[PDB]
Design a protein around this ligand. Structure first.
Ligand SMILES: NC(=O)c1ccc[n+]([C@@H]2O[C@H](COP(=O)([O-])OP(=O)(O)OC[C@H]3O[C@@H](n4cnc5c(N)ncnc54)[C@H](OP(=O)(O)O)[C@@H]3O)[C@@H](O)[C@H]2O)c1
Ligand SMILES: NC(=O)c1ccc[n+]([C@@H]2O[C@H](COP(=O)([O-])OP(=O)(O)OC[C@H]3O[C@@H](n4cnc5c(N)ncnc54)[C@H](OP(=O)(O)O)[C@@H]3O)[C@@H](O)[C@H]2O)c1
Ligand SMILES: [Cl-]
Ligand SMILES: [Cl-]
Ligand SMILES: [Cl-]
Ligand SMILES: [Cl-]
Ligand SMILES: [Cl-]
Ligand SMILES: [Cl-]
Lengths: 482, 482
């Protein structure tokens, strides 16, 4: 019983998080399905550390101080269940397993309940920050069996990104799958932000005809203002980056985006619970569309765009327009994200601290933005805040960007530039701010062909069927949603 | 053994389909969970028919000619499984159960396999056309256990809508859940169409300031050309329709769209299998957004739109623009739908006849369109057609609408009119026709923060990790999708 904690999984996240814990003075026992990788790790990256290895689960468990604490950082899915099944017979009541991978929240909820019945404390925790964050200070979103929290708080908050006054970007999120749900939403917002950034870049490149380094500079400048954020920052660096041959690397890269599930899950959750998280939807679909690379090559030969477009305006003015469009859309991204969190708390009874979640994102986090503090403030003033757009800071920002936003989109449309996210964000804003929508026509159509019934504005809750054609029956469908 | 067939479920679809079969000379045994409704039906709507009723399943089954044929038209979900469980003990090998409701295809696949093992032939069939279609001639999309097809073909094709030369809008779709899958896609396309129509109506109302009856006329006119279709037709009727007090009915209707699952399922399937069916996604979320009626009233108080917009152009010219925009977007809706069908065939091994499916939609069907014949022709010319937009008829149509399309959207944007479907449709067109997309930047970002690796254009399939920051490690994540 010499090791403070064990970690399973020796890819980018596992190796780096191990070294982080080591640097903070914790003895860590490393393990991996492919056992050869343990030795390779101890002989290289962990060469001069306190890290110890195991050749088997049995051995790994035996090295742990009680209550034993084991972290899993492996590919999400069956692998996590595989390890749990093997560990349970080796563990004692009160022992703790922490899944730090990108697992679906429903899986986490299930595992949490199963293991609790067996006396084992299960934590499902989101980890943000990628390689760098794992190595030096990640954002941690722990949820599950809170009985575990007291036994992991010290390590977790110990290694977590610290901000300003030294406050850790890691606090208990809530019960069962709450941690992984929050992490899911984190990735939804991330997907959205990345896609919007791509659309800005596409406008800079193809409407304004800017050079790679010129665009790098634009992002670098944007990073000093309201758009101050991790993603804007690295985009600037990416645009600057030169390959060993002196040419820029980005233009050499294949334009087919991968995805590993979290974005998709966010969109699916939104659909299942009826939350209009439109940006994430378009972001995921945009990745799918880019995957059709071969099709797009084919299509580019037959489908023509706007034939006669030339940008005849002030490039500098339009660049600023792009900036403001990006800012407003970024705001919608986050607002939708928080709508989804609020909906989850309602669906599952999780007591989520929205302001707190915002604070956890200030460091070691992919969606770190200068305005996360503003989000916290918003929920402080009004914990029941129904939407970020209703808070003054965000309402004002969007109001100030609105003109530029519409200008950028209209121009984009005229130029033939794909802006799935810019447009969906604006459509959402325009939809959400409208007291009357044409959805009443949808109701009329449904009642007309399917007898689904509808309600009058003047008396909501009472459903009616109308004999639209004058030749229909009286027997209608029932009024229900599904 | 006097009845030819039984049907369970006495709401709009069931009552009407029973009367349809009765008119074609088939003796039908009616049943329902709430048995009192059986007698009510025989005493009223079926008062002068050959319909017979049962007071129990046992009694209903005993009235059927072998092989026994039972149709289920009840609310999708558990209720279907409930009846199957109760029926199986009463049935003989070779008997046939037909689920005509809007069931999820995965449920249908499962039921089909389970019952096959028990000697019972299961058909899952989509039914289109609503009340009027059920009553006089529906589109029928039968799939499941093909051993049943010969035993139901006569009745099914008998009551199905007939087109032109008298060909029935009903043929065998494919194995297991294929029928219900096709039906799901049908509803996806339908949701998309309806939402597009609402957006055109919104533009007519709020940009062009047209009167109800004037807009009614516009749709009536549009229904004579390329937009000739069921939904355009009924929209014209709905706009004209006056309540008992002489005022138009539509403006009295509450602005909150319901949904019963199929649209949502389509979008989810699309996400799960990586097909960019963007229109259905926006259509479903638009309904969700409309449901936030109370929130929208609140938001309309705080969130301002474009302050200084006045339409200063030719109304007639812009009305035509809207028409062309609608047409192009409608085309995208169907194109996306068939991409999903193609994907399903691949995923599940279903041998789907795309042209045949288009033909089934020509009558008694909510998405009846004048150009369904064109879709059939396209797949005739090229059964491997990867996308409708690649066919000359559709390529040309979109090419001719393109200008008006962008004009409509750009104007809509400036006026502050929500166009989630118009804009997603156009974004998708612009994305799909582009050989190069900014997705390369997403790949760069992913590799930069998460070491997800990427490929070079010049050598696809070989994944690389780059040390973007110059201070990172060599251990990356693995390259995989999920
Ligand atoms: N309405 C349309 O235009 C449309 C078009 C095509 C297909 N469909 C599908 O066809 C099916 C029938 O649609 P519909 O609109 O006619 O009726 P519905 O409103 O969807 O369902 C009402 C029928 O389902 C029965 N039912 C509800 N819950 C039940 C339960 N728990 N156990 C047993 N029976 C139950 C009701 O029986 P009780 O009388 O005892 O309550 C009634 O007979 C549905 O699956 C629908 O999705 C609908
Ligand atoms: N990469 C990131 O920037 C990022 C950021 C935050 C969180 N995460 C999440 O954290 C976890 C680790 O991510 P990662 O990128 O470091 O690695 P990864 O590529 O997602 O997974 C590789 C690790 O999982 C193990 N593994 C794969 N399949 C397995 C199976 N069937 N049974 C047992 N182990 C299996 C591998 O073991 P072997 O060596 O034996 O093959 C290896 O240790 C993932 O769940 C990921 O979603 C990733
Ligand atoms: Cl991640
Ligand atoms: Cl605490
Ligand atoms: Cl050609
Ligand atoms: Cl339907
Ligand atoms: Cl045949
Ligand atoms: Cl106010």
């Amino acid at each position: 019983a010499q090791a403070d904690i064990a970690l399973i999984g020796l890819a980018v996240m596992g190796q780096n998080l191990i070294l982080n814990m080591n640097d903070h003075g914790f003895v860590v026992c490393a393990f991996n399905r492919t056992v050869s990788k343990v030795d390779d790790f101890l002989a290289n990256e962990a060469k001069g550390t306190k890290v110890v290895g195991a050749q088997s689960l049995k051995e790994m468990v035996s090295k742990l101080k009680k209550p034993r604490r084991i972290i899993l950082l492996v590919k999400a899915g069956q692998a996590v269940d595989d390890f749990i099944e093997k560990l349970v017979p080796l563990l004692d009541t009160g022992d703790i397993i922490i899944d730090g991978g990108n697992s679906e929240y429903r899986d986490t909820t299930r595992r949490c309940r199963d293991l609790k019945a067996k006396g084992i404390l299960f934590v499902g925790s989101g980890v943000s920050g990628g390689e760098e964050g794992a190595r030096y200070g990640p954002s941690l979103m722990p949820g599950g069996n809170k009985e575990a929290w007291p036994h992991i708080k010290t390590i977790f908050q110990g290694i977590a990104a610290k901000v300003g006054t030294g406050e850790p970007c890691c606090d208990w999120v809530g019960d069962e799958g709450a941690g992984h749900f929050v992490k899911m939403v984190h990735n939804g917002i991330e997907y959205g932000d990345m896609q919007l950034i791509c659309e800005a870049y596409h406008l800079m490149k193809d409407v304004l005809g800017m050079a790679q380094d010129e665009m790098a500079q634009a992002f670098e400048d944007w990073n000093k203002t309201e758009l101050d954020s991790f993603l804007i920052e690295i985009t600037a660096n990416i645009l600057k980056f030169q390959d060993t041959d002196g040419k820029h690397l980005l233009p050499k890269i294949r334009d087919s985006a991968g995805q590993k599930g979290t974005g998709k899950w966010t969109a699916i959750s939104a659909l299942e619970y009826g939350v209009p998280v439109t940006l994430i939807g378009e972001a995921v679909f945009a990745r799918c569309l880019s995957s059709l690379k071969d099709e797009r090559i084919q299509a580019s030969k037959k489908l023509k765009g706007p034939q006669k477009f030339q940008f005849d305006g002030d490039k500098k003015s339009f660049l600023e327009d792009i900036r403001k469009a990006l800012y407003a859309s970024k705001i919608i991204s986050y607002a939708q994200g928080f709508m989804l969190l609020r909906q989850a708390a309602t669906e599952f009874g999780w007591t989520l601290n929205y302001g707190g979640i915002a604070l956890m994102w200030r460091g070691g986090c992919i969606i770190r933005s200068v305005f996360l503090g503003k989000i916290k403030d918003a929920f402080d003033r009004n914990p029941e805040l129904q939407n970020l757009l209703l808070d003054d800071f965000f309402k004002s920002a969007v109001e100030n960007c609105q003109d530029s936003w519409r200008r950028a989109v209209s121009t984009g449309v005229q130029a033939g530039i794909p802006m799935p996210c810019f447009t969906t964000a604006l459509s959402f804003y325009d939809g959400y701010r409208h007291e009357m929508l044409p959805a009443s026509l949808i109701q009329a159509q449904r009642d007309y062909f399917g007898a689904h019934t509808y309600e009058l504005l003047a008396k909501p809750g009472q459903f009616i069927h109308t004999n639209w054609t004058g030749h229909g029956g009286t027997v209608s469908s029932s009024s229900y949603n599904a």
